[PDB]
RNA sequence: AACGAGACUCUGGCAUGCUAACUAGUUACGCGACCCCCGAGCGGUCGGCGUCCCCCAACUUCUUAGAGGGACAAGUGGCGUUCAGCCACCCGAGAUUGAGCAAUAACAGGUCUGUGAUGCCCUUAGAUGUCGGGGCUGCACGCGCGCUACACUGACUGGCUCAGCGUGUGCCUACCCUACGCCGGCAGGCGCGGGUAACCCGUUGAACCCCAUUCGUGAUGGGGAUCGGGGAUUGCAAUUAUUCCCCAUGAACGAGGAAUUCCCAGUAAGUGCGGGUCAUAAGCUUGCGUUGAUUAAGUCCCUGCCCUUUGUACACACCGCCCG
């Protein structure tokens, strides 16, 4: 085992980066938010649900055990 | 695979061709029904074998003479 | 439409909500202390589990010939992890299902009919197929 | 080595060798020269007419 | 399209095998394209019979291993539908051409074996069948995603699609293209 | 017990229990010094 | 009827068993006619050890 | 859940055929036969494979209990 | 958001604000996960957020609803202890009192000196279990000369 | 010429051919009843959904079990002495689906604790032949067969949806399987009814699987050992906890050395169920379904076995014999 740092709620830099990482990244899953930031992972699940209501991300597929989200579906 | 014919087949096959040479065709099914009438073979699977060898012999007997 | 046509995952999630609006279902006091079956290790997350289960009760009666408190439990039962011992099947609670079916019968969406089992009232059968088309109206079947 | 990647195809299978039958002798045609042929040892299950990917044809088989 | 199945959305046309060596054991589109990878359960009763069945199905078969996952072929197909989806968003290709490169780049060119002399280990270099290459390459990359997701927050779908990228474009960040070159490095030595 | 009558006084603090919990029927145990075949080594003599 | 039991008394040696089976057969012919001539003709003309059970009515 | 799916497919394939075999001519259904049997997957045929009977000394029909020499 | 507080101390055990409310509370002895999902609902608060997001007003109510469970209508059967024995009531025991209570019942069963206390004092299994192949701490045994 | 092999018996796989069925179904209406316009139309009717109604209806595809047929290396192409056979292919169920039965001769193998089978010896009233209690479960240790685990291909909580081999009171001496109604969180209690069983339980409304929430890489909510208190059931009796249930307690264990077992197609592995023992009780054994891979189409390297040739100081047979 190991020790990895995580945060269960946001602070400034995480939240502000969260809005601007979106157009920079084509793939968006909660797992990828775990590594690029230090985020719990369950935090990232609900964080993406918020963004989809704004239309800053787009759903592309959904399942019980895995969920995919994309940038804006533009090209 | 395997399934090399036993002596019980080869003994009676020769006999049945000698004394009922005329009745034979060269088809499987006709040669079966003849063996069923000119003799009784007490199994069904055994009958399907003895016919097939009787057929296979009758092919060669229409060439040069068999030595058995 | 008949209830056969539609998805059934969708069916219950609109039927559960329907009942709770209309003041229907007089619920037992015990609903926040209830494991809900012998083979569970926890209470449900849900806080309106009673409403959800009454949906699934009335649906099965539409399909099959209707049966009592015993049979409902057998339909719901699942696997029991006995720890170090190998898992086996077992049946869940009874006294919950005995409150469910009597609560439905108070609304006269079911009734004790002949041949050893409650059967769903024509008023009940009307209400099922009424909201069955509401499902198709909603999304689009 | 400094030879580029060669391609050569089976003409015939000869028989199996090794100390558990794990190697297979095979004859192969060079696929650029139709009168050239070398014998090889090939590990995997082969049929006939399939193509291999030799790194050299300096090597040649003679025994198990 | 109306006479030949896609994959449920993914064309099997504009898909090539870019070797002449490894085709006729890689095929996916001659008529072998189907809506789903599944069989009635005929796959082997002859040595040649193995080859015929699709590459995409073979991948699904070798994905379920190690005890708890055996006999759960439907769960396995969930991982594959996400894989192609992730591969297409992530790089943007016909996501089968990714897989075909990933298989061809992971198959060994030469291999070693054992030979008994003097009661001591000696090794001999030998060649490898095209059918061996395909079987090996399917094995190797599936071990990668299985290994990575054994304590990672990442799901196996994500891990597997990453593993086909690094195989399809060699970069030695995969479990496959590493392990390929290990074998060939041995085969040079004892030869 | 099996042979022996172990006597006991009855307390008011023992109520609910049985009689047989206050008289044992085996020697607690001591050891030991492992014996011969007490393992995959014991064997041979001639 | 299945009986699956040891082939070895006082178990020793390689563990073996033995399947025995009995196959019963039932079949019934329904008649509708006067009960006299039935009970007359039925009980006679039976050579083997085969059982028969007459019923007054069932339908 | 699984084997039912193959059963309903196998029946509807043959059902369609039989309707043409009885009320329409040969050349209609001969065509349809060539199409299905091309990607045969047990649409017009049936597996003969069913479970084999277990014998003692194993938990399966082939697999055996462990054997110890010491 | 919600940066207000994190790790805190409550009665007898330190409880983190890192974890969800119910699961956080379980660390305190005499409270399992099953016991906590009840007590939160009697308190009529969310269990869908972290323990660091509770206020002081709220957690003050929690311990009251916990330590008088009969008076907030949690059933008697759902408690740790029903008629302790020689105390005469239904009771619910929590962290540091649990150990004190536990040590008494050990002492009691050596006071009377039943079979129980002897097995306890000897360090052997209380319940019907074989000890022939069960245990080991020990195994170094030799016999040769 | 004979025994074994094979032949044989059982089982699986092929029948819209044959035989016939309210203790098995299907279809067809006759329908009348319920339901929603859900589609054309209006709600009727036509179509769709199941149930009651079903017959003096029609049929036997499905289910059931009987009589029969079918596969033979049969046909074709290679190969073989062109013999015996072998390889590929068409048709198609390919010449191997799995079991039962099994020779000569032998073993100082197991069983006097299956036997009112049995020799001889012993014991036989202070009995080795009956009641009460205790023990076969006692632990510093060594080994074998297994079960459950070490998580995210997961756990947890809801929702959906599929099966088969069987078995059951009227028996042993007191006992079965359970529907339905009522009461209880649960274990369970209580009131009624059916079943001699293709008739009643049971259209066996099973698990894995499937669909949606929650947890987040943390010895964690993974794991459930240890242990405290309380409630039920069986029995004449439950203590060294018979079994079952509720709350609490929360350990080792984070993929395993030297070694080693088993397996080739509905097979391995995962997963549940019935029977056996049973007053109460399977982590065992014996069968059955369900989901269902990877790898091989070989070889004598290891281990071992069959046949020939050869050597031998061996025949209690190399686990032999024999020297200082």
GROMACS .gro file of N, CA and C in nm, chain D residues 5-64:
model
  180
  289UNK      N    1   1.426  -0.697  -4.255
  289UNK     CA    2   1.330  -0.801  -4.222
  289UNK      C    3   1.293  -0.877  -4.347
  290UNK      N    4   1.308  -1.011  -4.342
  290UNK     CA    5   1.282  -1.098  -4.454
  290UNK      C    6   1.150  -1.165  -4.429
  291UNK      N    7   1.094  -1.224  -4.536
  291UNK     CA    8   0.966  -1.289  -4.536
  291UNK      C    9   0.988  -1.410  -4.621
  292UNK      N   10   0.941  -1.528  -4.574
  292UNK     CA   11   0.962  -1.651  -4.644
  292UNK      C   12   0.847  -1.738  -4.605
  293UNK      N   13   0.806  -1.829  -4.696
  293UNK     CA   14   0.679  -1.898  -4.684
  293UNK      C   15   0.705  -2.045  -4.688
  294UNK      N   16   0.611  -2.126  -4.633
  294UNK     CA   17   0.624  -2.269  -4.623
  294UNK      C   18   0.595  -2.328  -4.759
  295UNK      N   19   0.665  -2.437  -4.796
  295UNK     CA   20   0.633  -2.519  -4.911
  295UNK      C   21   0.584  -2.653  -4.864
  296UNK      N   22   0.634  -2.701  -4.748
  296UNK     CA   23   0.606  -2.835  -4.703
  296UNK      C   24   0.642  -2.836  -4.557
  297UNK      N   25   0.578  -2.925  -4.477
  297UNK     CA   26   0.614  -2.951  -4.340
  297UNK      C   27   0.679  -3.087  -4.340
  298UNK      N   28   0.780  -3.107  -4.252
  298UNK     CA   29   0.867  -3.223  -4.258
  298UNK      C   30   0.831  -3.315  -4.145
  299UNK      N   31   0.834  -3.266  -4.020
  299UNK     CA   32   0.806  -3.350  -3.906
  299UNK      C   33   0.842  -3.273  -3.784
  300UNK      N   34   0.804  -3.324  -3.665
  300UNK     CA   35   0.822  -3.254  -3.540
  300UNK      C   36   0.945  -3.306  -3.473
  301UNK      N   37   1.016  -3.217  -3.400
  301UNK     CA   38   1.142  -3.246  -3.335
  301UNK      C   39   1.139  -3.175  -3.202
  302UNK      N   40   1.256  -3.165  -3.134
  302UNK     CA   41   1.264  -3.122  -2.997
  302UNK      C   42   1.252  -3.243  -2.911
  303UNK      N   43   1.260  -3.224  -2.777
  303UNK     CA   44   1.261  -3.332  -2.682
  303UNK      C   45   1.126  -3.348  -2.618
  304UNK      N   46   1.024  -3.270  -2.665
  304UNK     CA   47   0.887  -3.294  -2.628
  304UNK      C   48   0.801  -3.273  -2.750
  305UNK      N   49   0.861  -3.268  -2.871
  305UNK     CA   50   0.785  -3.247  -2.993
  305UNK      C   51   0.747  -3.103  -3.013
  306UNK      N   52   0.808  -3.011  -2.934
  306UNK     CA   53   0.774  -2.871  -2.931
  306UNK      C   54   0.829  -2.793  -3.048
  307UNK      N   55   0.929  -2.847  -3.121
  307UNK     CA   56   0.986  -2.781  -3.236
  307UNK      C   57   0.933  -2.854  -3.356
  308UNK      N   58   0.931  -2.786  -3.473
  308UNK     CA   59   0.878  -2.843  -3.594
  308UNK      C   60   0.978  -2.808  -3.699
  309UNK      N   61   1.037  -2.910  -3.767
  309UNK     CA   62   1.112  -2.892  -3.889
  309UNK      C   63   1.017  -2.859  -4.000
  310UNK      N   64   1.062  -2.772  -4.093
  310UNK     CA   65   0.978  -2.724  -4.198
  310UNK      C   66   1.074  -2.681  -4.306
  311UNK      N   67   1.028  -2.688  -4.432
  311UNK     CA   68   1.099  -2.640  -4.547
  311UNK      C   69   1.027  -2.515  -4.588
  312UNK      N   70   1.104  -2.411  -4.629
  312UNK     CA   71   1.048  -2.282  -4.660
  312UNK      C   72   1.118  -2.232  -4.783
  313UNK      N   73   1.041  -2.158  -4.866
  313UNK     CA   74   1.080  -2.100  -4.991
  313UNK      C   75   1.093  -1.954  -4.961
  314UNK      N   76   1.194  -1.888  -5.022
  314UNK     CA   77   1.247  -1.763  -4.975
  314UNK      C   78   1.157  -1.646  -5.008
  315UNK      N   79   1.065  -1.663  -5.107
  315UNK     CA   80   0.957  -1.571  -5.140
  315UNK      C   81   1.008  -1.453  -5.219
  316UNK      N   82   1.131  -1.465  -5.274
  316UNK     CA   83   1.189  -1.368  -5.363
  316UNK      C   84   1.274  -1.447  -5.459
  317UNK      N   85   1.313  -1.569  -5.418
  317UNK     CA   86   1.387  -1.662  -5.498
  317UNK      C   87   1.311  -1.790  -5.484
  318UNK      N   88   1.278  -1.852  -5.599
  318UNK     CA   89   1.184  -1.961  -5.606
  318UNK      C   90   1.259  -2.092  -5.617
  319UNK      N   91   1.393  -2.086  -5.632
  319UNK     CA   92   1.478  -2.202  -5.637
  319UNK      C   93   1.559  -2.210  -5.511
  320UNK      N   94   1.551  -2.107  -5.423
  320UNK     CA   95   1.618  -2.106  -5.296
  320UNK      C   96   1.526  -2.167  -5.195
  321UNK      N   97   1.583  -2.242  -5.099
  321UNK     CA   98   1.506  -2.306  -4.996
  321UNK      C   99   1.601  -2.334  -4.884
  322UNK      N  100   1.554  -2.313  -4.759
  322UNK     CA  101   1.626  -2.340  -4.637
  322UNK      C  102   1.534  -2.420  -4.550
  323UNK      N  103   1.592  -2.500  -4.456
  323UNK     CA  104   1.518  -2.573  -4.356
  323UNK      C  105   1.526  -2.489  -4.232
  324UNK      N  106   1.419  -2.488  -4.148
  324UNK     CA  107   1.410  -2.405  -4.030
  324UNK      C  108   1.352  -2.491  -3.921
  325UNK      N  109   1.359  -2.439  -3.796
  325UNK     CA  110   1.286  -2.488  -3.682
  325UNK      C  111   1.193  -2.378  -3.641
  326UNK      N  112   1.062  -2.411  -3.625
  326UNK     CA  113   0.957  -2.315  -3.603
  326UNK      C  114   0.883  -2.372  -3.485
  327UNK      N  115   0.844  -2.285  -3.389
  327UNK     CA  116   0.787  -2.327  -3.264
  327UNK      C  117   0.640  -2.355  -3.279
  328UNK      N  118   0.565  -2.258  -3.337
  328UNK     CA  119   0.421  -2.256  -3.326
  328UNK      C  120   0.357  -2.356  -3.419
  329UNK      N  121   0.230  -2.391  -3.399
  329UNK     CA  122   0.154  -2.475  -3.490
  329UNK      C  123   0.142  -2.412  -3.627
  330UNK      N  124   0.184  -2.483  -3.733
  330UNK     CA  125   0.183  -2.433  -3.868
  330UNK      C  126   0.115  -2.538  -3.951
  331UNK      N  127   0.065  -2.496  -4.069
  331UNK     CA  128  -0.013  -2.579  -4.157
  331UNK      C  129   0.072  -2.599  -4.278
  332UNK      N  130   0.069  -2.502  -4.373
  332UNK     CA  131   0.138  -2.508  -4.499
  332UNK      C  132   0.086  -2.391  -4.575
  333UNK      N  133   0.179  -2.314  -4.637
  333UNK     CA  134   0.147  -2.207  -4.729
  333UNK      C  135   0.143  -2.075  -4.658
  334UNK      N  136   0.162  -2.075  -4.524
  334UNK     CA  137   0.162  -1.956  -4.442
  334UNK      C  138   0.300  -1.896  -4.446
  335UNK      N  139   0.312  -1.767  -4.409
  335UNK     CA  140   0.434  -1.692  -4.426
  335UNK      C  141   0.486  -1.665  -4.287
  336UNK      N  142   0.621  -1.659  -4.274
  336UNK     CA  143   0.692  -1.636  -4.151
  336UNK      C  144   0.756  -1.501  -4.163
  337UNK      N  145   0.832  -1.462  -4.059
  337UNK     CA  146   0.903  -1.336  -4.056
  337UNK      C  147   1.037  -1.370  -3.999
  338UNK      N  148   1.135  -1.396  -4.089
  338UNK     CA  149   1.270  -1.432  -4.052
  338UNK      C  150   1.348  -1.306  -4.030
  339UNK      N  151   1.435  -1.305  -3.926
  339UNK     CA  152   1.527  -1.197  -3.902
  339UNK      C  153   1.659  -1.223  -3.969
  340UNK      N  154   1.687  -1.350  -4.006
  340UNK     CA  155   1.804  -1.381  -4.084
  340UNK      C  156   1.782  -1.515  -4.147
  341UNK      N  157   1.859  -1.542  -4.255
  341UNK     CA  158   1.862  -1.669  -4.323
  341UNK      C  159   2.003  -1.721  -4.321
  342UNK      N  160   2.091  -1.657  -4.239
  342UNK     CA  161   2.222  -1.706  -4.206
  342UNK      C  162   2.212  -1.834  -4.126
  343UNK      N  163   2.119  -1.833  -4.026
  343UNK     CA  164   2.086  -1.945  -3.941
  343UNK      C  165   2.024  -2.056  -4.023
  344UNK      N  166   2.050  -2.184  -3.986
  344UNK     CA  167   1.997  -2.297  -4.058
  344UNK      C  168   1.990  -2.410  -3.958
  345UNK      N  169   1.889  -2.500  -3.974
  345UNK     CA  170   1.857  -2.603  -3.879
  345UNK      C  171   1.920  -2.731  -3.926
  346UNK      N  172   1.952  -2.824  -3.832
  346UNK     CA  173   2.018  -2.947  -3.867
  346UNK      C  174   1.975  -3.056  -3.772
  347UNK      N  175   1.930  -3.019  -3.650
  347UNK     CA  176   1.892  -3.116  -3.550
  347UNK      C  177   1.806  -3.049  -3.449
  348UNK      N  178   1.755  -3.128  -3.352
  348UNK     CA  179   1.676  -3.084  -3.239
  348UNK      C  180   1.755  -2.989  -3.147
   0.00000   0.00000   0.00000
